[PDB]
Amino acid sequence: GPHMATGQDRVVALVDMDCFFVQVEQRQNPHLRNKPCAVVQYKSWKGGGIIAVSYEARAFGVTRSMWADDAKKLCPDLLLAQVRESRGKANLTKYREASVEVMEIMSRFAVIERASIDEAYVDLTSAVQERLQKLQGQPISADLLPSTYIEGLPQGPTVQKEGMRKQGLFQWLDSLQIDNLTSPDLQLTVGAVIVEEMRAAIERETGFQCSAGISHNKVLAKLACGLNKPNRQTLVSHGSVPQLFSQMPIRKIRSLGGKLGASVIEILGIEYMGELTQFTESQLQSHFGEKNGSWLYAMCRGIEHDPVKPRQLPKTIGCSKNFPGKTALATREQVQWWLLQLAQELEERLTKDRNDNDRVATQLVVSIRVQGDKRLSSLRRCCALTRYDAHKMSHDAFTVIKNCNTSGIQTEWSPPLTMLFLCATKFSAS
DNA sequence: ATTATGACGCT
DNA sequence: AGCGTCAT
Ligand SMILES: Nc1nc2c(ncn2[C@H]2C[C@H](O)[C@@H](COP(=O)(O)OP(=O)(O)OP(=O)(O)O)O2)c(=O)[nH]1
Numbered sequence: 187g188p189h190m191a192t193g194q195d196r197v198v199a200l201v202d203m204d205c206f207f208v209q210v211e212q213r214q215n216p217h218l219r220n221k222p223c224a225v226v227q228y229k230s231w232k233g234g235g236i237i238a239v240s241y242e243a244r245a246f247g248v249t250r251s252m253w254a255d256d257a258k259k260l261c262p263d264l265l266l267a268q269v270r271e272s273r274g275k276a277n278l279t280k281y282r283e284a285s286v287e288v289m290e291i292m293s294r295f296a297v298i299e300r301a302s303i304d305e306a307y308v309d310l311t312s313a314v315q316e317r318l319q320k321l322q323g324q325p326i327s328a329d330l331l332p333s334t335y336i337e338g339l340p341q342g343p344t345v346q347k348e349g350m351r352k353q354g355l356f357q358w359l360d361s362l363q364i365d366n367l368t369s370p371d372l373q374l375t376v377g378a379v380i381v382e383e384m385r386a387a388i389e390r391e392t393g394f395q396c397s398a399g400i401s402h403n404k405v406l407a408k409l410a411c412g413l414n415k416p417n418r419q420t421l422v423s424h425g426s427v428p429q430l431f432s433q434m435p436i437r438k439i440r441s442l443g444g445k446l447g448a449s450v451i452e453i454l455g456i457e458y459m460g461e462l463t464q465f466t467e468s469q470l471q472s473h474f475g476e477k478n479g480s481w482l483y484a485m486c487r488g489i490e491h492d493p494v495k496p497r498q499l500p501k502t503i504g505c506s507k508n509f510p511g512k513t514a515l516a517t518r519e520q521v522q523w524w525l526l527q528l529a530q531e532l533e534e535r536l537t538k539d540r541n542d543n544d545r546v547a548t549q550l551v552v553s554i555r556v557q558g559d560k561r562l563s564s565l566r567r568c569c570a571l572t573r574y575d576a577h578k579m580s581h582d583a584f585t586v587i588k589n590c591n592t593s594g595i596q597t598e599w600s601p602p603l604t605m606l607f608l609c610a611t612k613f614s615a616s
Numbered sequence: 617a618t619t620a621t622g623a624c625g626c627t
Numbered sequence: 628a629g630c631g632t633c634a635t
Pocket residue numbers: 202203204205206207208237238239250303304305415416619620635
């Protein structure tokens with residue numbers, strides 16, 4: 187009733203770049219533009235592993251985690267760009283720098299939370315109030331929302347996708363009450379106007395296209411963003427949630443795509459997000475824990491409180507390489523050489539970070555995996571990071587891991603190492 | 617022999 | 628602190 191909070195207090199957007207690494211390579215090399223193309227890491231094994239795919243190539247069934255040789259069977263004309271290799275490993279610097287370009291543009295409009303290399307949440311509540319006071323009760327023209335979809339519309343009473351988009355937008359705009367500056371639907375609409383401007387700025391100033399979601403919280407904004415890709419944005423209103431969730435598989439909601447979501451499905455005997463509404467908060471807490479249970483109870487009603495954190499920079503800076511099958515490291519010289527390669531990349535990135543961002547990392551985390559273990563990490567150990575010196579960090583990493591060598595011969599390494607990882611953490615202002 | 621990360625929760 | 632989960 188009057189006291190039942192509805193989670194409509196904020197306007198939150200999620201901006202995610204379309205096929206990011208592909209767009210970075212297409213900007214650099216115009217010959218790849220408007221083509222089926224993909225970005226690969228390495229080349230000798232099955233043509234390299236695909237990590238990003240243009241929408242033209244997706245039409246042929248090309249996906250991430252596919253080997254390039256197999257993708258070429260689906261799409262013989264597929265074009266490929268390779269990630270840079272430095273010190274024997276993949277180097278993602280080009281894409282991190284392109285990410286900074288986009289993040290700095292978004293930060294002009296509002297404080298952002300960097301959620302990944304290619305996506306950020308935006309809290310637009312205050313910008314929306316400002317724009318509403320500027321509008322002075324003026325209604326919002328469809329011309330201000332030229333790439334916006336309104337989820338759930340059109341409804342009720344022609345055969346083109348753009349025509350349906352405009353039909354839905356006109357239904358939405360016709361139903362709007364522009365007199366009330368507190369109306370959540372109006373606030374979301376103004377938020378979408380701002381996100382159109384943000385996305386136009388990103389494309390004008392970088393050449394990159396993106397999609398976006400606009401809703402009242404982070405989970406709904408992320409889900410909305412996915413509904414109309416590429417190069418479009420989607421408004422998910424509070425009122426759209428019952429219908430949207432009534433056929434939404436639980437795994438589509440961020441954080442429910444793994445073991446927890448599978449357990450929701452199995453324990454409760456349901457398939458769709460909306461079915462969660464029939465359980466009490468205590469029932470959900472009893473199965474999934476106090477925190478998850480409260481989160482699910484609110485989330486299946488469209489309500490989530492997780493704040494957009496003011497954080498534009500990554501919290502950690504890390505370097506990792508797998509050594510699969512026969513390439514696994516089985517000598518001490520090998521382990522030391524590769525720890526040095528990783529540490530040299532880490533030193534480069536840390537020194538640039540300190541110059542750009544006025545901070546220093548203080549803890550070095552070393553992670554390995556040994557032959558046989560299905561786990562991502564077989565062991566993690568931390569030590570002090572007191573100097574941005576690659577030889578020092580590699581010697582310290584070796585010191586903290588060397589007790590894993592069960593070979594009585596110190597020259598051999600047994601079992602062989604199938605992963606090395608170095609991560610700088612615990613930043614302090616400098 | 618998908619690979620390279622990065623965030624956050626649990627105990 | 629070290630380990631697991633989830634994102635992709
Ligand atoms: N190294 C590495 N990079 C990855 C991996 N998965 C994704 N990436 C990179 C390449 C992607 O372009 C970028 C952003 O990922 P997204 O999930 O947002 O997909 P992408 O932007 O490629 O396409 P989309 O957002 O669906 O239009 O992250 C991976 O497993 N390893």
